[PDB]
From a paper:
CVA24v attaches to cells by binding Neu5Ac-containing glycans on the surface of cells which facilitates entry. CVA24v attaches to cells via shallow, surface exposed, Neu5Ac pockets. The CVA24v capsid is decorated by a total of sixty individual Neu5Ac binding sites which are further arranged into twelve local five-fold symmetries (i.e. twelve regular pentagons).
As a starting point to probe this strategy, divalent Neu5Ac compounds posed as attractive tools as they have potential to bind to the virion by simultaneously occupying two Neu5Ac binding sites. Compounds with a C2–C9 linkage between the two Neu5Ac entities proved more efficacious blocking CVA24v transduction than C4–C9 and C2–C2 linked compounds. To investigate the binding of compounds 16–21, we derivatized CVA24v by soaking CVA24v crystals in crystallization solution containing the corresponding compound (16 mM). The following structure determination resulted in data sets with resolutions below or around 2 Å and showed that all compounds, beside 17, bind by their Neu5Ac entity to the characterized binding site. The C2 and C9 hydroxyls of the parent Neu5Ac molecule are pointing towards the solvent. Thus, we find it likely that the spacer unit that links the C2 position of one Neu5Ac entity to the C9 position of a second Neu5Ac entity is floating in the solvent in a non-ordered fashion rather than folding back towards the viral surface to interact with the canyon on top of the VP1 capsid protein. Thus, the divalent Neu5Ac compounds does not seem to affect the thermal stability of the CVA24v particle indicating the mechanism of inhibition is not related to CVA24v uncoating.
Residue numbers in the entry:
A (entry chain 111): 605 to 885
B (entry chain 333): 341 to 574
C (entry chain 444): 2 to 13, 25 to 69
D (entry chain 222): 77 to 340
Write the structure that this text describes.
């Protein structure tokens, strides 16, 4: 299937007036060039292949950067650097989020890919053997680690991937896991109804998708015990929506995000650059 | 084992690759689908919807609701009412339309652009307005007598509120670039009083029209890219 | 269970797919779907509007 | 004889006439309907109140002035205190509804102005404090039939506790997108020289078959003056905008004692 060909047409002198309409109806303009000019025949062999939803979304996008370290930790703060936990979301970054938010609702499987990088913290503390990483998906309710070597990492039921530094970026598919019939990109509501004369706090409650969304937690550790040389790591998380359906198109984000909601920032709500005059080519 | 030999590309992560991968949640039972209204299949479906051009984005009106309405009056000036380049991805006024926003995820565009004008004066206001598209390579039109040598429509104001002017696909290249570019310049859209707006007494002598842009069914885009319209601090 | 399908044309043409995994979520991209109905957004009107006829009669 | 400008709508015991319409919109080309057995979720026999609830309710009128920046309502919030619809809504955990929205604004052949009338699925709006995100009280999110107004200024609160309302900034559609692109949503325009009414028929829209009406608004209704009201003899004149909405194909599940939401 191709985009529209142009038919051979000459002029008109007619009570048929395709150039006029009434957009008050909620209909967009419909007229095409053959309605208002003399046209030649042009066969259109060109297709809209690359603007299908699958084509538009068919990219692995970075959604977050996580940090983990491997060293001899002697303080609570340093023990907490030996592993990391991250609430799974696309709202840490802006690019994939903005593309998804052309739509109100979506349904897709997810390809997740990871890029893992290291550097030496210092040069005077010898070397470090090649590191193995554990990335554990903790679904809502499953116990979260409090130490890099606690019982949770045995991962009998949670899916884990063990990644060997220098190997191909690890990758796995996630089904459409939504508890509704589609994912909601926008939710105009609350998680509960506050009732007349209840003692529950109404002063510090939130609004929208943040009150209801929970895709669980990614937990990452270096499996190796400490070397004399401290190693610091970054884990870049990539998402590609595949087998995509979307519903109810929206105007795209016009101004910077300032969090997980639709809120905007007072110093960043002037996207247009003023033109010199209404008559500026 | 089966003798194999690794080729170039082995172990790379290409972000536009299209491979199978093991499922982390095997034999998961997805929520059954239901019919939801408003399913979209193609971004070009969204490009065919009219959205308002912020045509009057001048100092004091840019980034206000007053950036959209195009000033009209009953004075019959020979000066153009508005003038804009056919640069639908890169122009300061077209880039933030729905079509402009979609084009800024692509490198290449082709096809015809539809400009629909809604007159929002009183019922008692009459007028004739010339809407012109001049393909590029000549003096940009600043007078009606130059504008009327191009592709144009004479709009008679009346019961039918709206008039559609086409910028038909007229290009050397098969695609134009979604950037400001001399080689793929699109030409000039202008607007003049053909007669003038006339009102009787007890009627506003100044008023507005709204300009909408949409893609025609001959329109398509290529070469997915990141937009310059969203960013974040690092 | 090999699927043979048309490739997207290049400069100047079938390809073979076998699914290796028991979960459809594991599969490569959905095949090109050229489905469209812009009218649900561009003309969602109750009464048919004929382009050549007046929008308001 | 039959005209795109002249329409009658009857639902239950209620009828609307208009002699200056501009066709009617059916959002996403889909008429509302009851929930099919093959898409159903809650298993209790639903209440289908039909004519008691599926009828035109007229909200308090608002005044269009040369200085008005616009109006918003949420649905089903705007109808929560409307006759038997409100009673069926609050006696049940779950509800679904379509709507006929009829926006009414007449003037004269000497007045000018244009209202954009938009039906927005999941109309999530920005909060009015930069100390927090997504920080809106239930009471401010759910004003009922009075709805709210847009502003042309954004003045977020000094203290988080004072900013728990929508920053309904007109040109960003109160949600960080440009208002000029609102036409991607089901809409009509009331252009005073052309028409005195807008009619939008809305199916139920959600990622679920049925949901908690007291927790979740499915639709926003936005009325924006695209072109300001002008009248040469009196620039300070006001003309009413009247909103009349009929629930359609209403269906409720999970009957119990009545929901009485917090009012402060
Ligand atoms: C992350 C970082 O900046 N590391 C730097 C360290 C540390 O600052 C100190 O070793 C800590 O005391 O110092 C170096 O001179 C080193 O050890 O060779 C360079 C190295 O890049
Ligand atoms: Ca063709
Ligand atoms: Ca017509
Ligand atoms: Ca012709
Ligand atoms: Ca009944
Ligand atoms: Cl272990
Ligand atoms: Cl070890
Ligand atoms: Cl109320
Ligand atoms: Cl209360």
């Amino acid at each position: 299937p191709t985009a529209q060909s142009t038919p051979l047409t000459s002029g008109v002198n007619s009570q048929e007036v395709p150039a006029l309409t009434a957009v008050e109806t909620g209909a967009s303009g419909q007229a095409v060039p053959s309605d208002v000019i003399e046209t030649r025949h042009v066969v259109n062999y060109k297709t809209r292949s690359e603007s299908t939803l699958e084509s538009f979304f068919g990219r692995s996008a970075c959604v977050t950067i996580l940090e983990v370290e491997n060293f001899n930790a002697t303080t609570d703060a340093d023990r907490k650097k030996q592993f990391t936990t991250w609430a799974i979301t696309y709202t840490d970054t802006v690019q994939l989020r903005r593309k998804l938010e052309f739509f109100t609702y979506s349904r897709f499987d997810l390809e997740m890919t990871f890029v893992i990088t290291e550097r030496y913290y210092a040069s005077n503390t010898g070397h470090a053997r090649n590191q193995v990483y554990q990335l554990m998906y903790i679904p809502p309710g499953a116990p979260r680690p409090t130490a890099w070597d606690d019982y949770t990492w045995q991962s009998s039921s949670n899916p884990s991937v063990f990644y060997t530094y220098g190997s191909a970026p690890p990758r796995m598919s996630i089904p459409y896991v939504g508890i509704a019939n589609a994912y909601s990109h926008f939710y105009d509501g609350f998680a509960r109804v506050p009732l007349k004369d209840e003692t529950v706090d109404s002063g510090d409650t939130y609004y929208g998708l943040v009150t209801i969304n929970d895709f669980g937690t990614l937990a990452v550790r270096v499996v190796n015990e400490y070397n004399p040389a401290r190693i610091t790591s970054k884990i870049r998380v990539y998402m590609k929506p595949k087998h995509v359906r979307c519903w109810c198109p929206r105007p795209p984000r016009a101004v910077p995000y300032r969090g997980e909601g639709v809120d905007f920032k007072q110093d960043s709500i002037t996207p247009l650059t003023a033109v010199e005059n209404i008559n500026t080519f | 084992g089966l003798p194999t030999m690794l080729t170039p590309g082995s172990s790379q992560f290409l972000t536009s690759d299209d491979f199978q991968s093991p499922c982390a949640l095997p034999n998961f039972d997805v929520t059954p689908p239901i019919h939801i209204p408003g399913e979209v299949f193609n971004m070009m479906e969204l490009a065919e919807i009219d959205s308002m051009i912020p045509m009057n984005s001048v100092t004091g009106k840019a980034n206000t609701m007053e950036m959209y309405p195009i000033p009209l009056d009953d004075k019959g000036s020979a000066t153009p009412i508005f003038s804009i380049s056919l640069s639908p991805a890169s122009d300061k006024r077209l880039q933030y339309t729905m079509l402009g926003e979609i084009l800024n995820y692509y490198t290449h565009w082709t096809g015809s652009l539809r400009f629909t004008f809604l007159f929002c004066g009183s019922m008692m206001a009459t007028g004739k307005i010339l809407l012109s598209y001049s393909p590029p390579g000549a003096k940009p039109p600043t007078t009606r007598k130059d504008a009327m040598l191009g592709t144009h429509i004479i709009w008679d104001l009346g019961l039918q509120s709206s008039c559609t002017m086409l910028a038909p696909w007229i290009s050397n290249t098969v695609y134009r670039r979604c950037i400001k570019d001399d080689f793929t310049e699109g030409g000039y859209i202008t607007c003049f009083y053909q007669t003038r707006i006339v009102v009787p007494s007890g009627t506003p002598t100044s008023m507005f029209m709204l300009a909408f842009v949409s893609a025609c069914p001959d329109f398509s885009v290529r070469l997915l890219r990141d937009t310059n319209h969203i960013s974040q601090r690092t | 269970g090999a699927q043979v399908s048309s490739q997207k044309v290049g400069a100047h043409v079938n390809y073979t797919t076998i699914n290796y995994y028991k979960d459809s979520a594991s599969n490569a991209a959905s095949k090109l779907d050229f489905s469209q109905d812009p009218s649900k957004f561009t003309e969602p009107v109750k009464d048919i509007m004929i382009k050549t006829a007046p929008a308001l009669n | 004889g039959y005209s795109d400008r002249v329409r009658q709508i009857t639902l239950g015991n209620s009828t609307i006439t208009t002699q200056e319409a501009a066709n009617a919109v059916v959002a996403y080309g889909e008429w509302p309907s009851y929930l099919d057995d093959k898409e159903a979720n809650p298993i209790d026999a639903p209440t289908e109140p039909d004519v008691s609830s599926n009828r035109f309710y007229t909200l308090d009128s608002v005044q269009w002035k040369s200085t008005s920046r616009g109006w918003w309502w949420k649905l089903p919030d705007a109808l929560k205190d409307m006759g038997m619809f409100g009673q069926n809504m609050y006696y049940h955990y779950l509800g679904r509804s379509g709507y006929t929205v009829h926006v009414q604004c007449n003037a004269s052949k000497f007045h000018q102005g244009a209202l954009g009338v938009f039906a927005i699925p999941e109309y999530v709006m920005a909060c009015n404090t930069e100390a927090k995100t997504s920080y809106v009280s239930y009471v401010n999110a759910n004003p009922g039939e009075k709805g709210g107004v847009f502003d042309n200024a954004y003045n977020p609160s000094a203290e988080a506790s004072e900013g728990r309302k929508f920053a309904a900034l007109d040109y960003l559609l109160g949600c960080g997108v440009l208002a000029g692109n609102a036409f991607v949503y089901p809409h009509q325009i009331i252009n005073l020289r052309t028409n005195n009414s807008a009619t939008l028929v809305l199916p139920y829209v959600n990622s679920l078959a049925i949901d908690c009406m007291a927790k979740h608004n499915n639709w926003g209704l936005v009325i924006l003056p695209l072109c300001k009201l002008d009248y040469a003899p009196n620039s300070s004149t006001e003309i009413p905008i009247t909103v009349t909405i009929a629930p359609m194909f209403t269906e409720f599940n999970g009957l119990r004692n009545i929901t009485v939401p917090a009012t402060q």
